[PDB]
C-alpha cells in the first residue's frame, strides 16, 4: 500500500550502514594487521556475525515488508531463516565467548596461566559457531525427525504453532546466556574494581556492547513471552519493530568499537 514506502526506504539505508561498517571493521583488522589478537579476534567474529545478518536477512526481511507475500520459493525462505539464525546465535555466543575469556584472563589468574592464544580462540569460535549449525539442523527438517509449513504465503518458522519448544529455545538462548554473562560481567566488575584506564575503556565499550544486547532485544524476547500465552496479545506493527530493534543492536555494535576505544579512530580515519 502506498503509505509505507516511507518506512521501507529508511531499511535500505539501515541496511547500507550495517553491511558497510561491518565490512569496515574486517577492512580494518585485515589491512591494518595491528589488531590481531584474541579479543580482537572474537570482536571479529561479532563483526562476521553482523554482516551475515546484514548482507543477509536485511534485504530479504525489507523485500518481505514491501511485498506482504512469501514467494521466493521455499527453500530460499529456509535458508533465510537459517542464515537469521546462525547470525543471532553467533553474534549472543561470540560476545559470551568474549565475556568468559575477559572473566578467565582477569580471573586472578592461578589455573589459566596457558594459552589465551589463536588455539583457545579458534576452538572456542568454531564451537559457538557448530552450536549455531546444530540449531539450524532441526529447523530446516522438521517434520523428518519429529512427526509435527501448512502456508503456501507468509512462510515462517516451521515451530511457529508449538508453544513450549518456542518458549525453551527463547530462554534458553537469551537467559542463560544473558544470565550467565551477567554473572561473569559482575565478577568481572569485581575483579577489576580490586586492582585499579585503559581497563576503564575495555571494561565500558564491553558495557555498551552490554547495553546494546539487552536493551536491544529485551522487548522482542518478551513479545515472545507475551505472545505464547495469549494470541489476542499479537500486533504486527511491534512485532517488526521489535525484530528492527534487534538488527538495529547488530548495527550498533559497529559504532560501538570505535567510539570506545582510541585505536580503531586511527584505524578508521585513514
Ligand atoms: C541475540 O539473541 C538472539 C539469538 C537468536 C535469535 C533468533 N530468534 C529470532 C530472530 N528473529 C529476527 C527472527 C529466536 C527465536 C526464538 C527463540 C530464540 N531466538 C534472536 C536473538
Not at 49 to 66: E, H, Q, S, T
Not at 213 to 223: A, D, S
Amino acid at each position: 500500500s502506498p503509505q509505507l514506502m516511507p518506512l521501507v526506504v529508511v531499511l535500505s539505508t539501515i541496511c547500507l550502514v550495517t553491511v558497510g561498517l561491518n565490512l569496515l571493521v574486517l577492512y580494518a583488522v585485515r589491512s591494518e594487521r595491528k589488531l590481531h589478537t584474541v579479543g580482537n579476534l572474537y570482536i571479529v567474529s561479532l563483526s562476521v556475525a553482523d554482516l551475515i545478518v546484514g548482507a543477509v536477512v536485511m534485504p530479504m526481511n525489507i523485500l518481505y515488508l514491501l511485498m506482504s507475500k512469501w514467494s521466493l520459493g521455499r527453500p530460499l525462505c529456509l535458508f533465510w531463516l537459517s542464515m537469521d539464525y546462525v547470525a543471532s546465535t553467533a553474534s549472543i555466543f561470540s560476545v559470551f565467548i568474549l565475556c568468559i575469556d575477559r572473566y578467565r584472563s582477569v580471573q586472578q589468574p592461578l589455573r589459566y596461566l596457558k594459552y589465551r592464544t589463536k588455539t583457545r580462540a579458534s576452538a572456542t569460535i568454531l564451537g559457538a559457531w557448530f552450536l549455531s549449525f546444530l540449531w539450524v539442523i532441526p529447523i530446516l527438517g522438521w517434520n523428518h525427525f519429529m512427526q509435527q509449513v501448512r502456508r503456501e504465503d507468509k512462510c515462517e518458522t516451521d515451530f511457529y504453532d508449538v508453544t513450549w519448544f518456542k518458549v525453551m529455545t527463547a530462554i534458553i538462548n537469551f537467559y542463560l546466556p544473558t544470565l550467565l554473562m551477567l554473572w561473569f560481567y559482575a565478577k568481572i566488575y569485581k575483579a577489576v574494581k580490586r586492582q585499579l584506564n585503559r581497563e576503564r575503556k575495555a571494561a565500558k565499550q564491553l558495557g555498551f556492547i552490554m547495553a546494546a544486547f539487552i536493551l536491544c532485544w529485551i522487548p522482542y524476547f518478551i513479545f515472545f513471552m507475551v505472545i505464547a500465552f495469549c494470541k489476542n496479545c499479537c500486533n504486527e506493527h511491534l512485532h517488526m519493530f521489535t525484530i528492527w530493534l534487534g538488527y538495529i543492536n547488530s548495527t550498533l555494535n559497529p559504532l560501538i568499537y570505535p567510539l570506545c576505544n582510541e585505536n580503531f579512530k586511527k584505524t578508521f580515519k585513514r
